[PDB]
């Protein structure tokens, strides 16, 4: 009988991969052919994005169920590890089955297969529940101390077959880290896959000048740079926030899920923004899309912190309470990105023809603002203390 930490970490890694699987078709999409084949390509792109969002939400629901199930189960043994492996294996099929269902809604086979997958997940979780309750010493201390465990043995089974409830903070952190890491390095995978200069390619087009062939692919490298920087800074904000949380609630979990779902779209936004169009109006539209995606990504982290503030008296560390030693700094740190993204958006309307340059300048502004945030907060508070 051993601690279950590592098996839950492995399960969280698997769940991150499975949830974010369906992003690959979106980034691997036929991005931009000239002469505006959009009138027919945009239906495909929108279908792919919708499938991505739906699959991510479904897998997140499955992950939440898993987190609760192994919250009631405290310890692990050789049998529970294998049962959890079976549960993970059956979970891994949800994206493909959902995509098949949406692809062929009229044929009942897809819906039947999705139902089969859900039933399998439920059955395996029920087996885990039964195994745990058949051996009392595996349950969490609270459950096996209680005398009503008999009712819980059926209650949890009924669940597996509200906003104030706790989630596992550790598993929220693990899943969020997995998703952030997958997204940040998303479009370096394809660069490695297909962007190394072919010897014949350089020989014919670039007459053997490898430097010319390399520079021909600058835009995708720049897009990767921007995407990684933005996603890393969003993760930094998330990490700073969650270093100060005592307990995580279901509302915070839902807001985190929304934040991650919207974070997932940044690689596409940057790929498109560096996929230069024929005329600059499309470029302004691309910048607007990037700004709105970033705002949507970060506003939900800010919303999560504000929601936790409603019960700070129990939910947060004292250092972040109202009037705390770092409350102002935390608010500024979480509000930075939404402000910059919103201003970059508004610039497209107010100072349109300079907005692309303003977006580029904002990309450089935000990281430095994060780096000096404590110093700038101190300076601003010192200035405003006597006003």
């Amino acid at each position: 009988i051993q601690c279950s930490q590592r098996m839950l970490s492995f399960s969280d890694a698997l769940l991150s991969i499975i949830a974010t699987v369906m992003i690959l078709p979106v980034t691997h999409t036929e991005i931009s052919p000239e002469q505006q084949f959009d009138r027919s390509v945009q239906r495909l792109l929108a279908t792919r994005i919708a499938v991505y969002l739906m699959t991510f939400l479904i897998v997140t629901v499955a992950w939440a169920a898993h987190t609760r199930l192994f919250q009631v189960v405290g310890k692990t043994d050789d049998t529970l590890a294998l049962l959890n492996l079976a549960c993970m294996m059956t979970i891994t099929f949800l994206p493909y089955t959902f995509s098949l269902m949406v692809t062929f809604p009229d044929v009942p086979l897809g819906i039947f297969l999705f139902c089969v997958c859900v039933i399998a997940i439920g059955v395996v979780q029920a087996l885990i529940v039964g195994y745990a309750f058949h051996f009392p010493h595996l349950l969490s201390p609270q459950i096996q101390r209680s005398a009503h465990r008999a009712l819980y043995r059926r209650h949890v089974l009924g669940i597996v077959l509200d906003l104030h409830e706790p989630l596992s903070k550790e598993r929220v952190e693990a899943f969020s880290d997995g998703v952030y890491a997958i997204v940040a390095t998303l479009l370096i995978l394809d660069i490695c896959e297909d962007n190394v200069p072919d010897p014949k390619d350089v020989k014919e087009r670039f007459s053997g000048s490898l430097v010319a062939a390399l520079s021909a692919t600058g835009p995708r490298f720049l897009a990767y740079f921007g995407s990684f920087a933005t996603v890393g800074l969003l993760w930094f904000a998330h990490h700073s926030l969650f270093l100060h949380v005592r307990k995580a609630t279901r509302a915070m979990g839902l807001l985190n899920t929304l934040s991650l779902a919207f974070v997932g779209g940044l690689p596409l936004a940057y790929q498109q923004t560096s996929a230069f169009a024929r005329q600059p109006r499309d470029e302004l539209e691309r910048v607007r899309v990037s700004c709105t995606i970033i705002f949507l990504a970060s506003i939900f982290q800010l919303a999560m912190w504000t929601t936790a503030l409603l019960h700070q008296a129990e939910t947060l560390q004292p250092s972040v309470w109202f009037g705390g030693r770092e409350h102002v700094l935390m608010f500024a740190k979480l509000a930075l990105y939404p402000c910059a993204s919103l201003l970059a958006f508004a610039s497209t309307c107010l100072l349109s023809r300079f907005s692309v340059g303003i977006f580029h300048l904002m990309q450089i502004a935000v990281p430095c603002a994060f780096l000096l945030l404590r110093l700038l907060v101190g300076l601003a508070l010192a200035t405003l203390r006597v006003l």
Partner: peptide, 28 residues
């Protein structure tokens, strides 16, 4: 066109965040 409308939706989102923060402050 829509850009200003979607910007207004963004403004509404930040406004609900602000109202949540102010409610928390008032509760203290």
């Amino acid at each position: 066109l829509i850009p200003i409308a979607v910007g207004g939706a963004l403004a509404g989102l930040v406004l609900i965040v602000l109202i949540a923060y102010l409610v928390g402050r008032k509760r203290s």
